[PDB]
Design an enzyme around this catalytic site. Structure first.
Site, PDB file in Angstrom:
ATOM      1  N   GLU A 113      27.433   4.992  44.697  1.00 38.27           N
ATOM      2  CA  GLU A 113      27.370   6.412  44.957  1.00 38.27           C
ATOM      3  C   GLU A 113      27.184   7.170  43.642  1.00 38.27           C
ATOM      4  O   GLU A 113      27.698   6.755  42.610  1.00 38.27           O
ATOM      5  CB  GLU A 113      28.649   6.850  45.677  1.00 38.27           C
ATOM      6  CG  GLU A 113      28.661   8.283  46.106  1.00 38.27           C
ATOM      7  CD  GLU A 113      27.569   8.590  47.097  1.00 38.27           C
ATOM      8  OE1 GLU A 113      27.763   8.269  48.289  1.00 38.27           O
ATOM      9  OE2 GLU A 113      26.517   9.149  46.668  1.00 38.27           O
ATOM     10  N   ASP A 173      28.948   2.601  49.004  1.00 37.99           N
ATOM     11  CA  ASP A 173      29.526   3.314  47.877  1.00 37.99           C
ATOM     12  C   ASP A 173      29.865   2.510  46.634  1.00 37.99           C
ATOM     13  O   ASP A 173      29.755   2.979  45.503  1.00 37.99           O
ATOM     14  CB  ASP A 173      30.726   4.116  48.332  1.00 37.99           C
ATOM     15  CG  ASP A 173      30.351   5.227  49.265  1.00 37.99           C
ATOM     16  OD1 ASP A 173      29.337   5.926  48.965  1.00 37.99           O
ATOM     17  OD2 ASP A 173      30.985   5.434  50.333  1.00 37.99           O
ATOM     18  N   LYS A 180      31.663   5.839  61.222  1.00 41.95           N
ATOM     19  CA  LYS A 180      31.098   5.054  60.117  1.00 41.95           C
ATOM     20  C   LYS A 180      30.683   3.675  60.568  1.00 41.95           C
ATOM     21  O   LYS A 180      29.580   3.214  60.266  1.00 41.95           O
ATOM     22  CB  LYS A 180      32.090   4.892  58.975  1.00 41.95           C
ATOM     23  CG  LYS A 180      32.291   6.102  58.129  1.00 41.95           C
ATOM     24  CD  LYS A 180      31.102   6.328  57.245  1.00 41.95           C
ATOM     25  CE  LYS A 180      31.396   7.404  56.254  1.00 41.95           C
ATOM     26  NZ  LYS A 180      30.137   7.901  55.709  1.00 41.95           N
TER      27      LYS A 180
HETATM   28 MN   LIG Z   1      30.937   7.141  51.651  1.00 46.78          MN
HETATM   29 MN   LIG Z   2      27.590   6.789  49.769  1.00 44.49          MN
END
Ligand SMILES: [Mn+2]
Ligand SMILES: [Mn+2]
Ligand SMILES: [Mn+2]
EC number: 3.1.-.-
Length: 201
Positions: free
Chosen positions: A85, A113, A139
């Site tokens: 990320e 991430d 998610k």
């Molecule tokens: Mn995330």
């Molecule tokens: Mn992400």
């Protein structure tokens, strides 16, 4: 109390590096930080949590995971996490490819991430203003790479993680939860929290 601006809150309460990374992300996705302001704050918060999740965690000379909270890690320590990320699209996929064709771990369909070199898995971090179970399911249903580990934090201290495996020690996760608390409290002081919470949708 007086209603503050989210712009002022973000600039005052996040490191300028985080803010710049968030603005860059919104630009890449065609989002205006001066208009989707709650999104902007959420992006900053999420980036900060990604960084905090990785901070202080190393793999030692023996290959064991350790925590070093001082300023100087010894030269032979390796960072435990790769942070995906915050990187622009090309570089993020570049890093993901480098990890994958290397560690042998298979390639995810959406950018995760983090990558955890101890546990040998990608991680999707989430930060929610809603119930953690609902957000976890959202998610999970989205990615279902099902090698990707999911770890959700809320602003009220609840967590949910894949297979009830929380990856980190209690204190690391307490640092994150304390920061989230602080953000919530400061937004509330500025009369920004109720609307921020309701914006997540
Ligand atoms: Mn995330
Ligand atoms: Mn992400
Ligand atoms: Mn280092």
């Amino acid at each position: 109390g007086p209603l503050g601006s989210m712009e002022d809150f973000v600039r005052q309460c996040f490191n300028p590096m985080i803010v710049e990374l968030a603005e860059k992300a919104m630009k890449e996705y065609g989002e205006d930080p001066k208009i989707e302001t709650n999104k902007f704050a959420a992006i900053c918060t999420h980036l900060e949590v990604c960084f905090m999740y990785s901070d202080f965690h190393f793999i030692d000379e023996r290959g064991e995971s350790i925590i070093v909270e001082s300023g100087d890690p010894n030269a032979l320590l390796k960072h435990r996490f790769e942070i995906i990320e915050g990187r622009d699209r090309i570089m993020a996929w570049t890093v993901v490819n480098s990890i994958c064709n290397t560690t042998g771990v298979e390639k995810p369909k959406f950018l995760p991430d983090l990558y955890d070199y101890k546990e040998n898995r990608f991680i999707e971090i989430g930060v929610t203003r809603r119930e953690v179970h609902i957000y976890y399911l959202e998610k999970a249903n989205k990615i279902k790479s099902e090698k990707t580990h999911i770890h959700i934090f809320s602003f009220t201290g609840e967590e949910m993680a894949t297979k009830a495996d929380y990856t980190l020690d209690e204190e690391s996760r307490a640092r994150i939860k304390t920061r989230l608390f602080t953000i919530r409290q400061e937004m509330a002081s500025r009369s920004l929290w109720d609307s921020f919470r309701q914006s997540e949708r």
